[PDB]
Amino acid sequence: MVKSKIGSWILVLFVAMWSDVGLCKKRPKP
């Protein structure tokens, strides 16, 4: 968005890193 809104990815980063670990290990439902 703006150069001022650069410290927002860091957030989505953490949630991304976690959501990442919860991909290849959580296994599918079906």
3-state secondary structure of 1: coil
Cα distances (angstroms) measured from residue 23 to each of 1, 12, 30:
28, 16, 14
Report the structure determination method: NMR
Say how far apart CA 12 and CA 16 lie, in whole Å. Answer: 6
Sign of CA dihedral 6, 13, 11, 16: positive
Concatenated DSSP letters for 1-30?
Answer: --TTTTTTHHHHHHHHHHHHHTTSSS----
